[PDB]
Amino acid sequence: GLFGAIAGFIEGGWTGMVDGWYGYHHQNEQGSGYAADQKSTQNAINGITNKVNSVIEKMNTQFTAVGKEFNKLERRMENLNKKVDDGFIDVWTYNAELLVLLENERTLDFHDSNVKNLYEKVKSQLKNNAKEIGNGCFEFYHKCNDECMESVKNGTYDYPKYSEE
Amino acid sequence: GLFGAIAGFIEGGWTGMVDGWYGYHHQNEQGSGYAADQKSTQNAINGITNKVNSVIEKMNTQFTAVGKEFNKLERRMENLNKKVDDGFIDVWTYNAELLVLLENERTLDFHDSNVKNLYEKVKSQLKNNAKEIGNGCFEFYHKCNDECMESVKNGTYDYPKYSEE
Amino acid sequence: GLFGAIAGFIEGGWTGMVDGWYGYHHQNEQGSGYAADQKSTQNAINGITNKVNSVIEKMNTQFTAVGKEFNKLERRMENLNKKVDDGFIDVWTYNAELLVLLENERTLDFHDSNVKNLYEKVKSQLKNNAKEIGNGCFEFYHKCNDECMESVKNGTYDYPKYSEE
Amino acid sequence: ICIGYHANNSTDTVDTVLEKNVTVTHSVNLLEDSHNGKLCLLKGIAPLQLGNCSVAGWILGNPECELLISKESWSYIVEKPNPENGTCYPGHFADYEELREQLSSVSSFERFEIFPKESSWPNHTVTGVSASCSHNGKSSFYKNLLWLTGKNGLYPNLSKSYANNKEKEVLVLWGVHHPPNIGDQRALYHTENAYVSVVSSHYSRKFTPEIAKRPKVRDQEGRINYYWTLLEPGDTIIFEANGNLIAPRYAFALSRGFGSGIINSNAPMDECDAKCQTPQGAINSSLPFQNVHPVTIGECPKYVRSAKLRMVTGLRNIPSI
Amino acid sequence: ICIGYHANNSTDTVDTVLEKNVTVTHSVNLLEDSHNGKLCLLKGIAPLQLGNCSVAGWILGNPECELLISKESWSYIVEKPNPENGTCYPGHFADYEELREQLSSVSSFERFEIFPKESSWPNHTVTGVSASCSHNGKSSFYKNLLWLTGKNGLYPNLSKSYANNKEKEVLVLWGVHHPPNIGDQRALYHTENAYVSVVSSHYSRKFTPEIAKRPKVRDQEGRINYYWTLLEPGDTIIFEANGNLIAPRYAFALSRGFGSGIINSNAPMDECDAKCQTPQGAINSSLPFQNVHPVTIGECPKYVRSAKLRMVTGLRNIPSI
Amino acid sequence: ICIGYHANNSTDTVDTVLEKNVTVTHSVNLLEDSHNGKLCLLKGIAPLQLGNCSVAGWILGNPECELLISKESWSYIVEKPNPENGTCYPGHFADYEELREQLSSVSSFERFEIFPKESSWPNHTVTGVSASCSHNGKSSFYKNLLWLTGKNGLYPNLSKSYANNKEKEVLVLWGVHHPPNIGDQRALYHTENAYVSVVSSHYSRKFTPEIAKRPKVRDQEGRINYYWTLLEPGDTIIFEANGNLIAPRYAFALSRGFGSGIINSNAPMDECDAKCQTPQGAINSSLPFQNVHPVTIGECPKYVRSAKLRMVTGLRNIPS
Ligand SMILES: *[C@@H]1O[C@H](CO)[C@@H](O[C@@H]2O[C@H](CO)[C@@H](O[C@@H]3O[C@H](CO[C@H]4O[C@H](CO)[C@@H](O)[C@H](O)[C@@H]4O)[C@@H](O)[C@H](O[C@H]4O[C@H](CO)[C@@H](O)[C@H](O)[C@@H]4O[C@@H]4O[C@H](CO)[C@@H](O)[C@H](O)[C@H]4NC(C)=O)[C@@H]3O)[C@H](O)[C@H]2NC(C)=O)[C@H](O)[C@H]1NC(C)=O
Ligand SMILES: *[C@@H]1O[C@H](CO)[C@@H](O[C@@H]2O[C@H](CO)[C@@H](O[C@@H]3O[C@H](CO[C@H]4O[C@H](CO)[C@@H](O)[C@H](O)[C@@H]4O)[C@@H](O)[C@H](O[C@H]4O[C@H](CO)[C@@H](O)[C@H](O)[C@@H]4O[C@@H]4O[C@H](CO)[C@@H](O)[C@H](O)[C@H]4NC(C)=O)[C@@H]3O)[C@H](O)[C@H]2NC(C)=O)[C@H](O)[C@H]1NC(C)=O
Ligand SMILES: *[C@@H]1O[C@H](CO)[C@@H](O[C@@H]2O[C@H](CO)[C@@H](O[C@@H]3O[C@H](CO[C@H]4O[C@H](CO)[C@@H](O)[C@H](O)[C@@H]4O)[C@@H](O)[C@H](O[C@H]4O[C@H](CO)[C@@H](O)[C@H](O)[C@@H]4O[C@@H]4O[C@H](CO)[C@@H](O)[C@H](O)[C@H]4NC(C)=O)[C@@H]3O)[C@H](O)[C@H]2NC(C)=O)[C@H](O)[C@H]1NC(C)=O
Ligand SMILES: *[C@@H]1O[C@H](CO)[C@@H](O[C@@H]2O[C@H](CO)[C@@H](O[C@@H]3O[C@H](CO)[C@@H](O)[C@H](O[C@H]4O[C@H](CO)[C@@H](O)[C@H](O)[C@@H]4O[C@@H]4O[C@H](CO)[C@@H](O)[C@H](O)[C@H]4NC(C)=O)[C@@H]3O)[C@H](O)[C@H]2NC(C)=O)[C@H](O)[C@H]1NC(C)=O
Ligand SMILES: *[C@@H]1O[C@H](CO)[C@@H](O[C@@H]2O[C@H](CO)[C@@H](O[C@@H]3O[C@H](CO)[C@@H](O)[C@H](O[C@H]4O[C@H](CO)[C@@H](O)[C@H](O)[C@@H]4O)[C@@H]3O)[C@H](O)[C@H]2NC(C)=O)[C@H](O)[C@H]1NC(C)=O
Ligand SMILES: *[C@@H]1O[C@H](CO)[C@@H](O[C@@H]2O[C@H](CO)[C@@H](O[C@@H]3O[C@H](CO)[C@@H](O)[C@H](O[C@H]4O[C@H](CO)[C@@H](O)[C@H](O)[C@@H]4O)[C@@H]3O)[C@H](O)[C@H]2NC(C)=O)[C@H](O)[C@H]1NC(C)=O
Ligand SMILES: *[C@@H]1O[C@H](CO)[C@@H](O)[C@H](O)[C@H]1NC(C)=O
Ligand SMILES: *[C@@H]1O[C@H](CO)[C@@H](O)[C@H](O)[C@H]1NC(C)=O
Ligand SMILES: *[C@@H]1O[C@H](CO)[C@@H](O)[C@H](O)[C@H]1NC(C)=O
Ligand SMILES: *[C@@H]1O[C@H](CO)[C@@H](O)[C@H](O)[C@H]1NC(C)=O
Ligand SMILES: *[C@@H]1O[C@H](CO)[C@@H](O)[C@H](O)[C@H]1NC(C)=O
Ligand SMILES: *[C@@H]1O[C@H](CO)[C@@H](O)[C@H](O)[C@H]1NC(C)=O
Ligand SMILES: *[C@@H]1O[C@H](CO)[C@@H](O)[C@H](O)[C@H]1NC(C)=O
Ligand SMILES: *[C@@H]1O[C@H](CO)[C@@H](O)[C@H](O)[C@H]1NC(C)=O
Ligand SMILES: *[C@@H]1O[C@H](CO)[C@@H](O)[C@H](O)[C@H]1NC(C)=O
Ligand SMILES: *[C@@H]1O[C@H](CO)[C@@H](O)[C@H](O)[C@H]1NC(C)=O
Ligand SMILES: [Zn+2]
Ligand SMILES: [Zn+2]
């Protein structure tokens, strides 16, 4: 949507992947599987948990507020009272609804950034070491095993390129 | 602005292009012109129509709101009435002005995202098929006719790259 | 954060750099140092000054608001005054606190965009003239002196590529 | 093949968060600024136009409000800020401001003569008017109240009752009169103690006349205090007095409704129809905000003090290569 | 190696600024909609359940409110929307709504016999009841006030004083009786003048009987107006009267406290220990908002008219391997 | 060439969404917390500092309020929470809280003697005081009201009128006395019925004395109920009475103005020329929010309960 990852050049998610929000789907000769990311997931969890906690924190608990019973020569004070009660309800409803609505697009795009930020740091690591297909995938000229695979999160590479050109 | 497309690496807009917000200006030997995009355009109108309507929805019509006319011995109650009526007008005036102010930067950046999202998806299609000049244009190695050019909307290319090195 | 530059592929700021928010650290034979950028920096200062000023502007100065002194038989009106006084302070507190909280993230994301947008416009400048290490740095194969290096502000290059492939 | 964006010559100014005066391709005035300039109707129904009368006069029936007595249904009420008719006989209108608010709820009237002038008071003179309450050159009095006086040098004990069979609340109005001399009190009512009792099942009050000299208002040294109460279905109201009672002649059976109000306006009336009315003029409401007036009637956009409320929809405009 | 994102079976619909109906992996309801349905306790302490009585009847001692006289502590008060047991003997309740707001702060009572029935009024008969205030088949009277009558054809000048030594404000109530005939007045108090003085250091009022025929309510033509005042620690209240004084019998030493209130609710009582109580039911308050009722008791979520308030936490859901 | 961003030694913490304790290079206070601690002036004009008197005692002239009688202009009013000088002689102050609001609007006075002590009441004694209103060791009374008493065994019918030719609204105060005994009533005014009439063109009220035994407040068993009304330019006010009238002596031609108010404060007076004043102190207002006090006078920042209001201007700070 706002960033090009979701529904853009990576048009989908993987039901197979659990244990995190982001990760990889390696298709190796030594087995395949959905190894879910760790650093970017828990970092996103920290942020959204703070988002939520930081949103309800800003909302005081409504302590006792009860009706007021005005008299027959008090229609005016009765209407003014209702004008206040309704006016504040109106303000808190709008403040509440307008916050989730606006903050929803921001939360979704936040994940968009996290994924697009993960698409890099790997395109940036595999500078000339892998083929970039426009579906969010990388074809290794390497036959990268389960040792260098966990070495895409970090890396002190057997860097020399072997020819496939 | 937030993304580099508008007023950034595409320093101007095209008065020539109508029929949409984004599009292309192909320079082929079989004629040039401003073929305006459709998919990203109608998709963007949907969202801005949603934003606007989802914003005015959150504003219930007023209704009859009338003065209260107090007597010479009800000065306190008069100020409290003036304090409520004015206090609410302020909360709504501020909110309304602050809403368009904040949400305008969001909409402008949204078009930026949409344009930058369209500058991609063509670099993703023309992998080795053209020279990328940073003015939002692509000079082709191919002699892409007015048949494959409209195949930039999707792309089922007679792909083999021709050398121009 | 939202963009990949700050705390991302550029893991820090430079204490050495003063005189601006963004800039460069050239490693030349004619001396090195932290040359602070000018165009994007003042542009960010302009934007941040309006944010602040456009935000305090939306806050009309509180004029005389004093207690109201009810008598022994006006508890209802006494509470109503408190309900109005508090209900509104609650609204202004939330509006004030929630504004800095959300717009602070926008400001950081705003700076992130500017640095990442500055990382571009140079990749668009140094199209094929330097090796990009994903650390926000460029080692030139060129021997760009402090004359062409000061030409990263504009760029009129002794363009020929040197064989380095 | 090139990637770019649309542009036109539009001069639509917009204030963004990092830049003011931002020109944009498309936008929309989210705030209503223009108004009709006239007092229009409200979904077809017309408002109660009080003219030179104040609520005080219309509900008491200031003879100079000859023309307001017909209208008995309405969408809203218009009052001149300083209406020249009202009371006309000096005094206090007990709870005036509440009664205004009572009628602000009313959607229709049925004015009826609770105590018909003719046949309600035999043995009591009912032919009483004042130069202070003059209409068409002649001295008059309110159309809805009635001034009872001694008849044949006698003000016999008074007891008149009304029981509410209108199955609507009946706004009962009456008043008490205060002479300046002891002579006027004695010459008019034939007693100096003078009681005035008004008792319902929800209202009871005993009135007694206070005689004293007062500053001349409307060339009158006396005063007439104006009271009133709503009488719920089934209830009865009993008026008893030894003198000084301005008896009720006409009262009103109220039908309550939603959305009416009292507004002050100098704007003229037309035949235009409108969903929203303000003292300034009608408003053709389609926007959520407006800034012509905080007072509003009907279905209107929420009022704000703002001037622009622009809200861009498109993107930046960059013509000329 | 491919980079992608999580997905689940979640059907959680959510609304964004540019898109409605967005299904997502994870979210939070953020708004309380379900409630307990019953009037529960509040952090253990139970509410003063008024039953068929109104505050007027509870605090005056409507004999039919026999069972409420015991309870002297509570977290909150509940009143039926239409309580049929109150001022059994008709009259005006001076500032009733204010006394209600007074009691909303009280957290505890100390009902005590200010003027003991036996020994407070020798020389005045106090065995006076009315069929309007009938309790258990026999006519009765309010348990907290007391009806002083003539004894042996005399209503001697009355004077009873009380000094507040309770170190708390004393809610004193009293009433004045207005006979319908002159006959009942002379037969009951043996005088037609009849004064009633009630004096504090901060309260003074002289009451006088306005005798008149009124519509019979609870088949009664007379009336009793109910007055009251809080009496500050150290202050003394003096009652003097020539007749028509309905003397105070039991008073209340009020102890003020934090957030209590009077609510109208027809939900039944149960044994649940709710942290929040509303007229509709209790709420197990964890969410920041609520929409069951704007009236609330205890520590509760902010009330809003909203229906959804979802707030996604996860991301877009795109299944199908 | 490397592209990067600035950083400094700043310890400026900021709370953003999704991350607390976020250090940043630059920010702005956005919330005023410090205050002057003293009662300042208001764009030069000084406040009506009432001392031990309550507004009731100030406007009625509690003789112990001698010094407040001079000042006739002020920017705001300051009152002690529990001032022991006010209605020195017990009685009720009719609409007292409202008269506070009326005066809270007032910006200037013209104190003048509506009914001069000498010559206003011949045939009536005016030399009457109460130990309740004692000043400087001697029994006294209010400076602005006047106690009419019977003279030579007679309290003849009273009737006085006043015409507002002051082209400003004139606040008239008066009182009605209720003796505790019928003995005191007969010896003081020489009659037992006793009416007291007060009539303006839009104000009328007849007071009658309720004699009864009451608890002694300020060692007095009697009471004086205090009334007052506004008299518009042109209006005349008519006083009639048979006895028990606490007559007006000094009245006030009121001048209305813009935002003034009454505040409660123990803060001292200073010579500072502050633009905003609160019970706690003055505020050197430049920020949009503040949290020193909800009570405020003049052009001031909106009061909020907040503690922080950080608002970053720079970017994240990352040394090392
Ligand atoms: C609200 O309150 C005001 C009163 O304060 C009232 O306005 C006036 O209403 C009266 C009617 O009661 C108008 O007064 C005069 O009535 C005469 C009748 O006119 C004829 O009309 C037809 C056909 O010929 C017949 O129905 C009828 O029988 C008559 O044949 C008319 O002759 C008067 O004309 C002018 O003559 C003199 C000159 O000195 C003057 O006294 C009048 O006031 C009026 O003078 C001024 O001249 C011009 C031209 O008229 C005008 O521009 C100017 O405004 C006039 N004066 C002022 C002060 O503005 C006249 O019609 C009178 O016009 C109404 N207006 C004013 C301002 O007095 C309202 O009707 C009340 N509204 C209600 C109750 O709804
Ligand atoms: C608020 O106000 C009302 C009235 O004050 C009150 O509730 C209604 O009326 C009575 C209370 O006076 C309710 O209960 C009654 O109980 C009696 C008999 O039951 C026993 O009660 C005690 C304890 O067990 C002992 O004395 C002894 O054990 C009794 O036997 C009796 O008064 C009622 O019995 C029937 O007969 C009466 C005539 O005497 C008749 O009028 C009733 O209608 C009733 O018929 C029953 O109707 C109900 C309706 O469904 C139901 O019980 C059943 O269908 C009928 N009986 C049988 C055996 O099948 C009665 O049981 C009465 O229930 C209340 N009515 C309603 C609709 O609630 C409230 O309690 C008051 N609240 C307060 C004061 O807080
Ligand atoms: C303007 O404002 C000033 C204040 O700046 C005010 O002056 C004060 O006036 C009050 C009286 O209203 C004075 O208080 C009195 O103090 C007297 C002496 O102090 C005794 O108590 C203390 C503490 O225990 C001891 O240290 C000391 O040795 C004394 O024992 C005292 O005599 C007064 O008490 C009673 O005396 C008179 C008549 O004799 C009578 O009013 C009462 O009997 C009174 O009160 C009694 O006690 C309680 C009060 O708590 C009361 O409830 C009870 O009913 C009373 N008892 C009886 C039997 O009825 C009184 O306490 C004070 O000293 C004055 N000066 C100062 C500097 O405070 C002026 O009066 C004001 N001028 C105006 C308005 O014109
Ligand atoms: C405590 O609370 C209880 C409620 O639990 C109260 O009791 C209830 O309220 C009434 C008073 O006791 C009782 O109402 C009755 O309704 C019956 C309807 O037919 C009938 O028995 C009476 O109502 C009318 O009936 C006749 C018509 O044929 C009349 O002769 C009769 O007098 C009544 O008439 C008129 O009613 C209308 C009402 O619209 C009035 O406007 C008129 O004023 C009435 N006529 C006259 C001449 O005045 C009877 O009223 C009800 O039975 C009773 N019991 C219950 C269980 O509800 C207690 O009174 C209360 N006690 C306190 C507060 O001390
Ligand atoms: C319905 O409203 C009309 C006005 O729209 C109202 O009639 C007006 O009433 C006043 C008072 O009667 C008039 O104003 C007068 O002006 C004339 C001359 O221009 C003067 O004679 C009056 O002066 C006073 O005279 C003495 C000196 O002060 C006093 O002893 C005496 O009490 C007078 O007040 C006064 O200044 C005005 O002319 C009329 N007419 C109009 C057209 O305004 C009418 O009374 C209202 N209806 C009812 C039933 O009262
Ligand atoms: C408010 O109320 C209080 C009491 O009701 C009152 O505080 C009092 O103020 C005055 C003046 O500030 C004090 O009266 C003084 O008492 C002492 C001696 O005991 C001295 O300050 C004074 O004596 C000397 O001072 C001067 C010479 O330099 C001369 O004025 C004098 O002749 C003496 O030489 C004077 O007697 C009183 O003590 C205090 N009481 C306290 C503080 O408890 C205050 O004035 C009231 N404010 C008003 C009415 O505006
Ligand atoms: C007063 O009314 C009575 C009512 O019966 C009637 O006889 C007559 O009209 C009047 N009395 C007279 C005229 O004596
Ligand atoms: C008329 O009523 C008065 C007071 O209401 C009373 O004094 C007088 O006796 C009555 N006359 C009768 C009953 O004939
Ligand atoms: C009330 O009764 C009178 C009979 O005197 C009748 O004329 C009137 O129509 C009745 N009211 C209604 C609403 O029918
Ligand atoms: C103004 O009024 C109606 C009602 O809102 C509106 O629909 C219409 O477009 C406008 N024009 C006319 C002529 O009514
Ligand atoms: C919302 O989405 C749900 C699940 O995708 C679907 O069942 C429902 O039809 C949608 N409702 C709309 C679009 O109003
Ligand atoms: C009445 O009571 C008073 C005191 O309360 C007493 O003086 C008098 O003797 C009593 N009369 C009796 C007991 O008859
Ligand atoms: C409230 O009731 C029980 C006991 O606290 C708890 O298990 C339940 O989840 C709660 N209901 C809510 C939070 O809706
Ligand atoms: C940061 O640096 C300057 C001196 O270089 C100093 O004045 C300032 O106080 C320093 N702040 C710190 C160390 O927090
Ligand atoms: C929060 O405060 C500072 C930085 O703001 C730092 O010590 C750390 O992040 C937190 N405090 C502690 C004691 O860790
Ligand atoms: C006061 O006294 C004399 C009578 O002794 C009288 O003539 C004079 O007019 C009176 N003055 C008034 C009432 O102002
Ligand atoms: Zn019982
Ligand atoms: Zn002195």
Residue numbers in the entry:
A (entry chain L), B (entry chain F), C (entry chain H): 1 to 165
D (entry chain E), E (entry chain K): 3 to 323
F (entry chain G): 3 to 322
Task: Reproduce passages from the article.
In this study, solving the crystal structure of HA derived from A/Thailand/CU44/2006 (CU44) led to a surprising finding of a divalent cation Zn2+ bound to the head regions of two neighboring trimers. Surprisingly, the highest peak in the anomalous difference electron density maps was located at the head domain at the inter-trimer interface, which was tentatively identified as Zn2+, based on native gel electrophoresis and absorption-edge fluorescence scan results. In the crystal structure, the HA trimers line up in an alternating up and down orientation with head-to-head interactions, where Zn2+ is bound between two adjacent HA trimers. In the HA structure, the carboxylic oxygen atoms of Glu68 and imidazole nitrogen atoms of His137 are directly coordinated to the divalent cation, which results in a distorted octahedral, six-coordination geometry, involving bidentate interactions of carboxylic groups. The Zn–O and Zn–N bond lengths are from 2.0 to 2.2 Å. The amino acid residues, Glu68 and His137, coordinated to Zn2+ are highly conserved in a broad range of H1 subtypes, although they are substituted with Asp or Tyr, respectively, in the early 1918 pandemic and the seasonal 1933–1936 strains, and not conserved in other subtypes and type B. The divalent cation in the crystal structure appeared to enhance the stability of HA, but significantly decreased the melting temperature Tm of the CU44 HA, depending on the Zn2+ concentrations. The acid-induced conformational change of HA occurred even at neutral pH in the presence of Zn2+. When the purified HA crystallized at 10–20 mg/ml by mixing with an equal volume of precipitant solution, protein crystals were produced at less than 0.4 mM Zn2+, whereas precipitates were found at higher than 0.4 mM. Taken together, our results suggest that Zn2+ binding to HA has two phases: Zn+2 binds specifically to the head regions of HA at low concentrations, whereas, at high concentrations, it binds nonspecifically to HA, causing conformational changes similar to those induced by acidic pH.
